[PDB]
Amino acid sequence: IVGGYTCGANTVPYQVSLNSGYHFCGGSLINSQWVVSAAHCYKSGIQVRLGEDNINVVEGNEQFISASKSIVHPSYNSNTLNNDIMLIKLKSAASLNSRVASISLPTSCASAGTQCLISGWGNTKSSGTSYPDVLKCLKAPILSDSSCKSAYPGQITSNMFCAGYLEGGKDSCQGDSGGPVVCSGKLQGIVSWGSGCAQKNKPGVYTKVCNYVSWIKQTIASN
Ligand SMILES: [Ca+2]
Numbered sequence: 001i002v003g004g005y006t007c008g009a010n011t012v013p014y015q016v017s018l019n020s021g022y023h024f025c026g027g028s029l030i031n032s033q034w035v036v037s038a039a040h041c042y043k044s045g046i047q048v049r050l051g052e053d054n055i056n057v058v059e060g061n062e063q064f065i066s067a068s069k070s071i072v073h074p075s076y077n078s079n080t081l082n083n084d085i086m087l088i089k090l091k092s093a094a095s096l097n098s099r100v101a102s103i104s105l106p107t108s109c110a111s112a113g114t115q116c117l118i119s120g121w122g123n124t125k126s127s128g129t130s131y132p133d134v135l136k137c138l139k140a141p142i143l144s145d146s147s148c149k150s151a152y153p154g155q156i157t158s159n160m161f162c163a164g165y166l167e168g169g170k171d172s173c174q175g176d177s178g179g180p181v182v183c184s185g186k187l188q189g190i191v192s193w194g195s196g197c198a199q200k201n202k203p204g205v206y207t208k209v210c211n212y213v214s215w216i217k218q219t220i221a222s223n
């Protein structure tokens with residue numbers, strides 16, 4: 001997260017860190033045994049880390065659980081990043097409490113101008129590389145489809161939306177991928193891609209979760 005602020009320990013209870021000896025992507029807990037993340041975050045040997053704040057120190061409240069299965073959307077395209085969404089089933093159910101809770105799936109899509117909270121342990125610099133120890137937060141509005149497509153001509157599909165600031169300085173970044181974009185208590189987006197980070201006229205692009213609600217439910221019900 002570039003230009004954000006320190007969330008505060010356990011203030012984003014549904015945030016998860018995907019770990020393979022180091023943090024590589026974020027994710028969102030949607031129920032006691034399933035996590036939603038980005039398809040481009042896929043890899044074998046994933047350990048899901050819940051209830052984290054400082055990812056480099058065991059502080060208490062953390063729950064480490066191995067992924068038993070990762071389900072990348074069958075129509076995911078690695079070149080265009082269309083359908084950049086993945087479901088991860090936990091080997092065992094997480095213990096839900098005030099520090100580890102699930103986030104609700106949307107019943108309807110969000111409209112332009114809606115304020116959302118984006119969070120993660122991704123890079124905090126636009127011109128450099130520096131990963132934070134604690135979870136960072138950023139409040140950002142969903143942009144109109146018109147401005148989104150003007151910013152990235154021919155690259156925005158109906159399964160994506162832009163959020164952020166055109167003047168630059170505030171954006172999600174590398175390492176935040178797969179993380180949550182929550183608006184009005186509902187998971188509306190997944191950190192997916194963008195051109196650089198926090199650059200002028202290049203807002204972040206996010207997977208539009210409202211288009212996948214039925215797919216998520218049907219997939220979870222059969223696994
Ligand atoms: Ca920790």
Ligand SMILES: [Cl-]
Nearest residue numbers: 149153154155
């Ligand atoms: Cl276009």
